[PDB]
Amino acid sequence: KHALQAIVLSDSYNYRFRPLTLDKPRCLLPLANTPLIEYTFEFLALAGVQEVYVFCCAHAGQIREYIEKSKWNLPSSPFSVNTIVSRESLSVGDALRELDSKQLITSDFILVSGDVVSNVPLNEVLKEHRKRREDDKNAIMTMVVREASPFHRTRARTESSVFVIDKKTSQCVHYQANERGKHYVSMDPEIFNEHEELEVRNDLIDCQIDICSNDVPALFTENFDYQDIRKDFVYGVLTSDLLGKKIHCHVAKENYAARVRSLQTYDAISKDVLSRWVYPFVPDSNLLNQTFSYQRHQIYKEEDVVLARSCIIKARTLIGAYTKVGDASVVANTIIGRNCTIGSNCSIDSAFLWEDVVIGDNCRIGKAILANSVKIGNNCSIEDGAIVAAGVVIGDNTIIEKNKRLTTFESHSQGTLNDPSLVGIGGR
Amino acid sequence: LQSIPIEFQAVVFAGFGNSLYPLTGSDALPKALLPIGNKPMLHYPLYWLEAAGFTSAILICMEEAEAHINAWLRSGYEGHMRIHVEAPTILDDSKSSADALRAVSHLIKNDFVCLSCDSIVGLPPYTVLDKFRLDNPSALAVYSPVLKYEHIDAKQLIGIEEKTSRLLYAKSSADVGSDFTFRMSLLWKHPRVTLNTNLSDAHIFVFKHWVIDLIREKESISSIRGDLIPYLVKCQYQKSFTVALIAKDGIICSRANNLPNYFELNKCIAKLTPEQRLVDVTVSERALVGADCMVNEGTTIKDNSNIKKSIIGKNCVIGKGVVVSNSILMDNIVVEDGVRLESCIVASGAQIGAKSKLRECEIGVDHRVEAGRIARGERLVDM
Amino acid sequence: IFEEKQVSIFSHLDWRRRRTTENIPKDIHPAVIRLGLKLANYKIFGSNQRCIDLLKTFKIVIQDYQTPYGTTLSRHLTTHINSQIAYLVSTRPLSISMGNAIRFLKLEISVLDIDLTDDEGKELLLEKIDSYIRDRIIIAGQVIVQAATEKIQDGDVILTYLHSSTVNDVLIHAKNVGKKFRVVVVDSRPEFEGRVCLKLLTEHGIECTYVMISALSYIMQEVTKIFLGGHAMLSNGALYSRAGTSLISLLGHESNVPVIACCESYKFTERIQLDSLVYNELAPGDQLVNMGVDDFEEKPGVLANWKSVKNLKLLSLKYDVTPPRLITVCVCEMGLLPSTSVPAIINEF
């Protein structure tokens, strides 16, 4: 009832994005002209978190830094933020064991892997969690989930799971993640006897936003074989690998909640944010003192945006400040960062533009991410799935095929720089 | 006047029960005639059907029970309603409801209400019929909370999709025991399903007429609770339906609605007593008291005995110091003089004598009992 | 007495309903019974479908109808029919379209001049029931659709309120012929029929916007045309449709947007009411309890015990009288006419 704290496992999904994030961490990527971590913080602030620990590995320098000069390190901040640098591929549990070894956990804490976007107030979810625990100390964790439809566009594969819940006590008695190849749902009978009402739900979105008790970091040192909070911990609790413990669900029927854990979720959530689903967390709220203004058909423009006449920008389009768009250019369903330049006769549809991206005349761009200071030459075609990492310069009359990942760095992703750009890569 | 065609025809199944073993080894008086409120078991499904508007019902009977059932129908059966009784030869113990329903398949022409003789139903008839009318399913089944057994069978597992009334799991809560599966194809369609072990099959069904020939051609379907299971509306289904979709529904509520298929004769009988003053038509003497209890006609009980919280049928006298408590008495029972019947069910035609003390004991038809106190037993007469 | 006209301005509106069949009269045909249940239960169908089902049911009624030979077909068929009607109106008050089809059938019951073997008598009757359903409803509807569709221009932003069969057919047809437009669906409490509309229109691949009636002023600035289906068109030229329709037409007028009423001719009436309160249909007050986003999801409401609370009364009218000056054009199978020319059409039958 006092002093809650939250554990943010940043760096969880880095390398899922990687072409991007060979430059800046995943938690600092802009979703809709705003850093991905800011959403998580605004969520924890909404929850009333007093203390945050951000487990981070790659680019922890930048992360450490953003957090210092951010408003969350100011004295008026709702919670104190502390970073914990770990080694590569940090697991949930490895961090929990590290939390136990360092003895950092007081009370109940909110455990989150990656970055969340949510306007769901956890305050009442906490009260139910505390009241449940005040007579039963074996009630270990409350799983926050979102009511949805089976084929909901926000309900991806990780979120696609079957829950079997006691309709009154809201106790999860069964969990199995959906994976095609497995065509059955089966659980031992004896549950039936013990409960007397039971709801099997394939309509739930597993947000993996979890309220945990004091026991968890200690329980993860006791069970050192546990690495995933779902198929190791939850499975173990339900199969009694971890003795005599109770797991619980909270079904949110309102609001919004989701995690940016992949490219396709980053895309779908970006849509869900431009639609007012995560209100008040929308561009025109300007939490970082922007100048975003809402307009009809979900068009978000900052001040000092230069729109030439005969330029037409269609629905669900966001444009950062100091951005120029050329004559006869059509921008539809795309997000554009600060200080960009788009030439004449361009057609940009469902794409993503971060800061300082320059695009020359006569270009067709669609369903692609163009990181900071990416330059696109005249008469270029960028197709679906394309990921153009920061700094990359595409030469004139060049076509990037679907899904090609381009970078400016030392590794796996195809194609450095200099035009005309790959093929003909002037790539080191 | 009779411009109106027949919407439903009612069929009631009265097999003779192997459960209620002490009560039913009889060819004397069948299961369907075992009294509840000093009225035969058959009275209540027939009363419910008559109040439902029905004027004609088909009673599938057992040929040994043929004679006696007919006998009660001509005289004793109150509800002014006509019952065509067909006891097909084919039916025998090694069978249950749906083959009995198949043996008379030619008699079924319209949509048909399928009831059991042990269906004690207080649920208002219109709610049942209107639901079948409004939803228009191929079949609708009624369920109810299990009985509470004030006194000192296998649980039912029912998974319905709330909010459509659709029924998606009907397997008994024993029987498949090892792993109790739910095929994932049922969670992409109908993603939200409520399960219940709290409910009991009320053996009340209403089928669209085409169902009767799913019974005709398919021979394996023995009983209805072994016939509703195989409805499946979601699966691969390569079973040659001739006859838009198939939809099976269920309904439940808080009222008296269950089956004396088990020992539940006792608890149903007990339940069956929201009533006012006890009938005049039997004589009981000063030097004795009964109250809150049911006594039927032409039973007599003389001085200093005790009838506490019990049921006494027609044709019986009781007397010389008897204490009967929480017990049930049927018919033709010469309660020898002075006994103790605490929590007992005695069958009709049964004589019990020379001080016989029975607790929690069930004693069969045409069975004398002499002295000889015992507690556990259901008894008896030999072989 | 059977009457209660008090200080309550809603005291005269018939609130008595029959929700179940309990004690249902014996002479009621099965097909009539099921219709009585669906009329009193469904959220899904309105005047047009109500009339079609009513007629097709009455054919079954007459078809299964057996002549007594103390009288014959002409004098007593109209009485048996009257019995079925009395039961149906007790489950739910008759729609104008239903009442007009009733006068049609009853008239044609009488005009057969003591002629035929009954079976022939039945035989024709179902004919102009078949023909009434054919000409007055289905054929006319198709005429209205193409008449209305050609008023749609490329770039139109069309507003439809609730769930209207006629208007839905117009829009669907419009995209089928390849018209470039988008639809604005306005919904309202207690039950949200606009969702059924939105569901339908998006499944036919039409661009759609969805708002509540509270956001009418806001969304109207995008709207270029308003299409309305009618439960009935009054003889003074007024439109008698769902409860929020006048608000649609009023704010539409203020934004210089044409109000287009689409109504079949047989739904015209001789009735003229000067307000929306004298002739209307009461909806269950308990419908207004549900907290909003969904209906029948079981949420309790502060107002749940309103029946027991003194001076607290919940109320939802089903219908609405939209004044003639707010209707731009009436589109029937006679073509596009001023709504005021309704009583003229009734003379041309």
Swiss-Prot record, chain A:
| GO CC annotations, alphabetized | cytosol; eukaryotic translation initiation factor 2B complex
DNA repair: present as a keyword of the record?
A: no
Example GO biological process: cytoplasmic translational initiation
Places the protein is found? Cytoplasm, Cytosol
Which parts of the chain are coiled coil?
Answer: none
Sequence positions bearing Phosphothreonine: T158
Give the record's family classification: Belongs to the eIF-2B gamma/epsilon subunits family.
Listed name of the protein:
Translation initiation factor eIF2B subunit epsilon
Encoding gene per record: tif225
Residue numbers of the full-length protein present here = 15 to 442 of 678
UniProtKB/Swiss-Prot annotation, chain B:
Disulfide bridge partners, by residue number:
none
Concerning CDD domains, the annotation shows: eIF-2B_gamma_N, LbH_eIF2B_gamma_C
Tell where it localizes: Cytoplasm, Cytosol
One annotated GO molecular function is: guanyl-nucleotide exchange factor activity
**Domain of life of the native organism:** Eukaryota
| One BP term from GO | cytoplasmic translational initiation
Q: Does the keyword Zinc apply?
A: no
GO terms for cellular component: cytosol; eukaryotic translation initiation factor 2B complex; guanyl-nucleotide exchange factor complex
Keywords attached to this entry: Cytoplasm, Initiation factor, Phosphoprotein, Protein biosynthesis
The subunit field of the Swiss-Prot or TrEMBL record says: Component of the translation initiation factor 2B (eIF2B) complex which is a heterodecamer of two sets of five different subunits: alpha, beta, gamma, delta and epsilon. Subunits alpha, beta and delta comprise a regulatory subcomplex and subunits epsilon and gamma comprise a catalytic subcomplex. Within the complex, the hexameric regulatory complex resides at the center, with the two heterodimeric catalytic subcomplexes bound on opposite sides.
* Family named by the database record: Belongs to the eIF-2B gamma/epsilon subunits family.
General function of this protein:
Acts as a component of the translation initiation factor 2B (eIF2B) complex, which catalyzes the exchange of GDP for GTP on the eukaryotic initiation factor 2 (eIF2) complex gamma subunit. Its guanine nucleotide exchange factor activity is repressed when bound to eIF2 complex phosphorylated on the alpha subunit, thereby limiting the amount of methionyl-initiator methionine tRNA available to the ribosome and consequently global translation is repressed.
Protein name (record): Translation initiation factor eIF2B subunit gamma
From Swiss-Prot, chain C:
Q: Which UniProt keywords apply?
A: Cytoplasm, Initiation factor, Phosphoprotein, Protein biosynthesis
What does the entry list under GO cellular component?
cytosol; eukaryotic translation initiation factor 2B complex
Q: Which residues form the signal peptide?
A: none
Keyword field contains Glycosyltransferase: no
Q: A single GO molecular function, which one?
A: guanyl-nucleotide exchange factor activity
Any Gene Ontology biological process = cytoplasmic translational initiation
- Disulphides: none
Q: Has the keyword Phosphoprotein been applied to this entry?
A: yes
First-listed, main subcellular location of the protein, grouped into a coarse class? cytoplasm
UniProt subcellular location: Cytoplasm, Cytosol
Quaternary data:
Component of the translation initiation factor 2B (eIF2B) complex which is a heterodecamer of two sets of five different subunits: alpha, beta, gamma, delta and epsilon. Subunits alpha, beta and delta comprise a regulatory subcomplex and subunits epsilon and gamma comprise a catalytic subcomplex. Within the complex, the hexameric regulatory complex resides at the center, with the two heterodimeric catalytic subcomplexes bound on opposite sides.
Q: What does this protein do?
A: Acts as a component of the translation initiation factor 2B (eIF2B) complex, which catalyzes the exchange of GDP for GTP on the eukaryotic initiation factor 2 (eIF2) complex gamma subunit. Its guanine nucleotide exchange factor activity is repressed when bound to eIF2 complex phosphorylated on the alpha subunit, thereby limiting the amount of methionyl-initiator methionine tRNA available to the ribosome and consequently global translation is repressed.
* Similarity comment: family membership: Belongs to the eIF-2B alpha/beta/delta subunits family.
This chain belongs to which protein, by name? Answer: Translation initiation factor eIF2B subunit delta
Name the source organism.
Answer: Schizosaccharomyces pombe (strain 972 / ATCC 24843) (Fission yeast)
Full protein segment contained here: 114 to 462 of 467
